[PDB]
Write a new protein. Structure first.
Lengths: 446, 446
């Protein structure tokens, strides 16, 4: 099963045929990409907010328009999927989802209202694909660059009526019915600790500082509870590399930042008429990113090494979290840098899957975002910025959907791509909930 | 070779698995969709400005979020393609193309600068897929709801340095090197009359009123020249249906409007804070659309009937033109109504192709546009409108990329889908210029 090795412009883009990405007929390669054999493992990579617009902007900047992302763009089976949410009150579609409702959709197979995690519009819990894999005896991993209580990773292990219920304090107040002391299952963090994935890596150390209001570990901080329940905690690259085993006996929990891990690139915020009134930007690497902080590609690779020791197989979800956040911040460089970061992780995943042979790799996003690529001379109502791309030309980016501080999500359907057994299921138009069924069936779970 | 019969939500969207669009594994069906056999015909459908955002918005409104476009969404092989143009001066990429540069790309295989038609950055002419099909003895048709001089249909038969050179007067001034009286090939309309496609249907009757400044029909109107060169002119649905033959001896030219044909639906324009300050809109059919004016599905059907009588096969390009135009006008109803209109034309194309068996059908857009689907409570800097959808819920649409009168094109990569032999070539990431090569090869042209 072939991954697309090179879809960059074949030559001189100004000459006939120079901008072609194809070198011959793809029929036979596509036939070789089709397999309904069972998937032993599944690696799901999510770029938060990574719509087709975000992937194009990032490719134009980092690789040039005729360039090619060796990870993101190399998946051969591609399609478009819908991710609308539901209005809790009426049960009707809500056309623009938030990250909580979308994550619940592919992780449980049931649509829900914006803000919910692991429950339907009736607030009923539904098992997640991770809980299910684990019950079947597979190793499971949840990796992200955001706080681990954030919507995307949390949806795999928590069931609460509001994404805001990070730890005990917030829960008692926002999710009283889930509050441990009110007999509920607990806050996002408490449920995370209970779920016990073999490998969990990300930010969000902060909430682990809270102390439980009830239960067996009442009085202890959630950090204390984790060590007590037998988790191996790590907080830096070095310690992370030191790990050799990760299992139910000694599950791994890496907390590399108080909040969200640091962004790869820095650049200024987009401004009103910024492509007109201001010079073009060249993004710059973040000096704080750090040698002590594992990159997404490093966290991905470690997770694969450890989960790979389970003969039954594994389920891994990897999230390039700050794409969405930088997009909300109307910060092109932060946004593009996080997409490039994600590409590196996709590469690692694809390299393993290619050699292992029974691994389904899927790359997609939870929903679309605000950023649009507009003409250089554009006079727009929102925030714009001109950037200097790898082509040595200027690309302008516009965030024009909000007058508030942060730019919002949008509802366009968007790319979904896959490689490996059962990837045919992402071709054509599908729904985000079909993703849950595709993964459950490929792994043969019940 | 199966078309996707139904990918609408299979059930109750609020229940587990109710929003699924799939009912089982797709591997086998995709294997049956793969064929490298030669294509006898090719039908290319272009929705101008119909990016993934435009398709989602129109689907949500007309069919409901969990709905399905029986034409547009029924193509089984899907991918995403890039359509960047080139800076004429530097030869570097220009990330946001206009319609002329994009149409030239798929129609000739060479990238060009914004505003060019059928020429490269050096202003050299390159033969189009239509000129090539005709030279090989295939029948050819060019159908559009815009003026026939507009960029999309023009690119198939004209080679001029500026898309503004509609007829003799504009040409003599804007494209002096092309002006007939200066020894050039002539204006867009004069070149259209020389290319002599078997079937050409659209608007733009107005420019045909100009008179040639030189040549054999000097002094006559372009309308008179057409009749004198033996074209069968028709101007209404009835005369169009009367046609029984269309060929080189008696080629058909239908001019159904002075300018662009009438839009399908009416609705007011989006406005600043329109989703807040104003009630939701329900689109209404346009009384002027007329029983005397053929619809895009009608023109497509008549064109297929006529071109089908050529044993060698045919090439037909069909354009749903006002999607782009209404999008530029910040008019949701006009925009969605043209997308629905195009779906009807895609249905007729697919019905024929499904029974004929050697027809490649491709549906895509020249570039992306401005509209974004945003939360209902959005307070945006641009123009917004709330719409009442088929789901009985409200969808809000934002045009936030221009302070000028018209909203602009954007540069995201966007969906391309196909059905038939050689459709595999649109899967994964490709470039718009690859489409010229895919069609040339599928048809076996030289
Ligand atoms: Mg996230
Ligand atoms: Mg057009
Ligand atoms: Zn999100
Ligand atoms: Zn988001
Ligand atoms: Zn266009
Ligand atoms: Zn356009």
């Amino acid at each position: 099963m072939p991954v697309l090795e090179n879809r960059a412009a074949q030559g001189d883009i100004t000459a006939p045929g120079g901008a072609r990405r194809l070198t011959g007929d793809q029929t036979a390669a596509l036939r070789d990409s089709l397999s309904d054999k069972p998937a032993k493992n599944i690696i799901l990579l999510i770029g938060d907010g990574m719509g087709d617009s975000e992937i194009t902007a990032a490719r134009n900047y980092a690789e040039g328009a005729g360039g090619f992302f060796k990870g993101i763009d190399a998946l051969p089976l591609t399609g478009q999927y819908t991710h609308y949410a539901l209005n809790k009150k009426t049960g009707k579609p809500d056309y623009v989802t938030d990250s909580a409702a979308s994550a619940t959709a592919w992780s449980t197979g049931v649509k829900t209202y914006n803000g919910a995690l692991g429950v339907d519009i009736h607030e009923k819990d539904h098992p997640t694909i991770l809980e299910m894999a684990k019950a079947a005896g597979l190793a499971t991993g949840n990796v992200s660059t955001a706080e681990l209580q954030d919507a995307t990773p949390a949806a795999l292990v928590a069931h609460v009526t509001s994404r805001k219920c990070y730890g005990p304090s917030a829960t008692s107040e926002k999710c009283p019915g889930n509050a441990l002391e009110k007999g509920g299952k607990g806050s996002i963090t408490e449920q995370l600790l209970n779920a016990r994935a073999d490998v969990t890596l990300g930010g969000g150390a902060k909430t682990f500082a809270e102390t439980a209001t009830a239960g067996e570990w009442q009085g202890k901080t959630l950090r204390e509870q984790a060590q007590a329940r037998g988790y191996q905690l790590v907080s830096d690259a070095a310690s992370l590399n030191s790990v050799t085993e990760a299992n139910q006996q000694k599950p791994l929990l890496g907390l590399f930042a108080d909040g969200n891990m640091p962004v790869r690139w820095l650049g200024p915020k987009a401004t009103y008429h910024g492509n007109i009134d201001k010079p073009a930007v060249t993004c710059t690497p973040n000096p704080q990113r750090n040698d002590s902080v594992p990159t997404l590609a490093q966290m991905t690779d470690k997770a694969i090494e450890l989960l790979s020791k389970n003969e039954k197989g594994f389920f891994l979800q990897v999230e390039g979290a700050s794409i969405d956040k930088q997009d909300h911040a109307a910060n092109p460089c932060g946004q593009i840098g996080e997409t490039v970061d994600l590409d590196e992780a996709v590469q690692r995943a694809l390299e393993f899957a290619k050699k292992e042979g029974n691994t389904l790799v899927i790359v997609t996003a939870d929903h679309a975002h605000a950023s649009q690529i507009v003409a250089p001379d554009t006079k727009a109502p929102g925030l714009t910025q001109a950037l200097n791309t790898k082509d040595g030309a200027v690309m302008v980016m516009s965030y024009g959907n909000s007058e508030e501080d942060s730019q919002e999500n949008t509802g366009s359907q968007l790319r979904i791509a896959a490689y490996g057994p059962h990837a045919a299921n992402v071709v054509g138009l599908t729904d985000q909930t079909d993703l849950f069924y595709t993964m459950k069936a490929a792994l043969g779970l019940k």
